[PDB]
Amino acid sequence: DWHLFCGDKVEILEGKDAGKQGKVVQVIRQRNWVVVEGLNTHYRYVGKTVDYRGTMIPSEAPLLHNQVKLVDPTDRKPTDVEWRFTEAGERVRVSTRSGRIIP
Amino acid sequence: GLAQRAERLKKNVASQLSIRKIRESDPNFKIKDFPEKAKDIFIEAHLCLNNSDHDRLHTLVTENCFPDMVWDIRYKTVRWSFVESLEPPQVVQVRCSSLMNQGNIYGQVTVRMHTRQTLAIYDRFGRLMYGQEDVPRDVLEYVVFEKHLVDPYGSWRMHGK
Amino acid sequence: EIYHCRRQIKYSKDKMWYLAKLIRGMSIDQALAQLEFSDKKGAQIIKEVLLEAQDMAVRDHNVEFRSNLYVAESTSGRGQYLKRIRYHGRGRFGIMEKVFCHYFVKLVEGXXXXXXXXXXXXXXXXXXXXXXXX
Amino acid sequence: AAPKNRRSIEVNRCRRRNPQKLIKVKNNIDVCPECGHLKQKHILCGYCXXXXXXXXXXXXXXXXXXXX
Numbered sequence: 001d002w003h004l005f006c007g008d009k010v011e012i013l014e015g016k017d018a019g020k021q022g023k024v025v026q027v028i029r030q031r032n033w034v035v036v037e038g039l040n041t042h043y044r045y046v047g048k049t050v051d052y053r054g055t056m057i058p059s060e061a062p063l064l065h066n067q068v069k070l071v072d073p074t075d076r077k078p079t080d081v082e083w084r085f086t087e088a089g090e091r092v093r094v095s096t097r098s099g100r101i102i103p
Numbered sequence: 104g105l106a107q108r109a110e111r112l113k114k115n116v117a118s119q120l121s122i123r124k125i126r127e128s129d130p131n132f133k134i135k136d137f138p139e140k141a142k143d144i145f146i147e148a149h150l151c152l153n154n155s156d157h158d159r160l161h162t163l164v165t166e167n168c169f170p171d172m173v174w175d176i177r178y179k180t181v182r183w184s185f186v187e188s189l190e191p192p193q194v195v196q197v198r199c200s201s202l203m204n205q206g207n208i209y210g211q212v213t214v215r216m217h218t219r220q221t222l223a224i225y226d227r228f229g230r231l232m233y234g235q236e237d238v239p240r241d242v243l244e245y246v247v248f249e250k251h252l253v254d255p256y257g258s259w260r261m262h263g264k
Numbered sequence: 265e266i267y268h269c270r271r272q273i274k275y276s277k278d279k280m281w282y283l284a285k286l287i288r289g290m291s292i293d294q295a296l297a298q299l300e301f302s303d304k305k306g307a308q309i310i311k312e313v314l315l316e317a318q319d320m321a322v323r324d325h326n327v328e329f330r331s332n333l334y335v336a337e338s339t340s341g342r343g344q345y346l347k348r349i350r351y352h353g354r355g356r357f358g359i360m361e362k363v364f365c366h367y368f369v370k371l372v373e374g375x376x377x378x379x380x381x382x383x384x385x386x387x388x389x390x391x392x393x394x395x396x397x398x
Numbered sequence: 399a400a401p402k403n404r405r406s407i408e409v410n411r412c413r414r415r416n417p418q419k420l421i422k423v424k425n426n427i428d429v430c431p432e433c434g435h436l437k438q439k440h441i442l443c444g445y446c447x448x449x450x451x452x453x454x455x456x457x458x459x460x461x462x463x464x465x466x
């Protein structure tokens with residue numbers, strides 16, 4: 001029973017970035033957090049000493065999974081996850097609102 | 104003078120090609136509304152340089168061309184300097200050119216303006232004076248406004264030169 | 265003010281303090297020449313510290329005149345100690361403590377002014393007449 | 399023998415500072431008549447001489463290698 005997986009479009013209900021929607025680049029289960037595309041912009045330093053040119057690049061800092069919710073392919077609204085077995089004889093996770101299959 | 108410039112902006116190959124890219128991709132935009140809005144963002148930019156606001160400068164104003172001026176102002180912070188600048192006036196607003204990139208969904212528009220700048224700099228405790236107070240310098244500037252397309256919000260971010 | 269510091273360097277603090285008090289109050293040039301021709305282990309190190317302090321003074325503070333720089337303060341602190349085993353006779357071991365010194369240099373602009381001159385007759389005739397009236 | 403009691407700070411300071419006079423500072427500094435570099439008094443320069451002594455050593459080694 002897991003919540004968020006890599007590649008899905010998700011919504012944020014909490015924080016400075018709350019309300020924005022975006023795909024997930026990477027999911028780490030060690031620190032329990034997710035990374036949303038083009039979200040929570042922070043400064044990163046990649047320098048070049050020989051070329052004398054330092055380069056500062058924006059990057060997406062990992063966000064807590066509790067502040068992030070999945071988006072249903074049909075309803076398009078943010079919703080909680082539920083585990084069900086469809087009539088096709090499959091084990092799947094679907095929205096608590098509609099019957100659309102998330103996977 | 105202004106008419107010839109306008110003809111060089113509208114009727115020239117590369118420029119009108121970039122305009123074609125914009126209009127075809129996003130018909131909801133407008134060419135004539137660009138210089139004034141970019142002017143406003145420029146004023147806000149200089150005001151951010153004066154008020155020393157890093158967040159708004161990074162998010163709104165500059166993208167990837169910032170670390171030069173940022174390291175400048177932050178080194179000025181290391182030397183503990185007070186930077187006070189004012190640049191309200193404007194004479195003639197005319198854009199320069201445009202350069203775009205397809206694959207990375209990137210864009211740039213070079214725009215030049217005429218502004219009267221007043222730059223005053225104080226240093227540390229001993230008040231080491233750099234620049235001049237209340238002196239209307241005449242400055243001609245070239246700023247390239249970049250456009251990037253993401254899902255949550257459109258990105259308009261200036262580039263100093 | 266221009267500050268410069270060096271830590272985790274291993275030298276005798278009491279010995280470095282000798283060359284530390286040497287350049288205290290003295291101007292940059294005289295201190296440079298001194299430390300250059302001074303004979304000790306601290307001479308080279310404090311010379312490096314001074315040179316770096318001058319480089320930082322010129323580059324960071326953008327000082328107009330280098331002659332307006334002098335040494336206002338210099339101090340030597342003590343860092344961590346490395347405990348080593350010194351083998352002695354009759355199966356006894358002594359503890360050899362390897363010391364450390366943290367060198368701190370504080371520079372202030374302007375011409376250096378130090379007066380150690382004190383008139384004996386004036387000070388006596390004043391302090392005695394003021395103590396007899398109190 | 400062994401110390402009777404631990405030394406106080408005052409005695410230590412007065413002993414380690416005043417009589418030794420720290421390091422007495424005289425003027426050893428003089429300008430080189432040739433290159434104008436600052437060097438020690440009553441002594442040859444360390445700039446225009448060490449390089450010429452190394453060039454004279456290389457010339458003596460080259461002459462000794464050419465003569466052999």
Ligand SMILES: [Zn+2]
Pocket residue numbers: 430431432433434435443444445446447
């Ligand atoms: Zn010489």
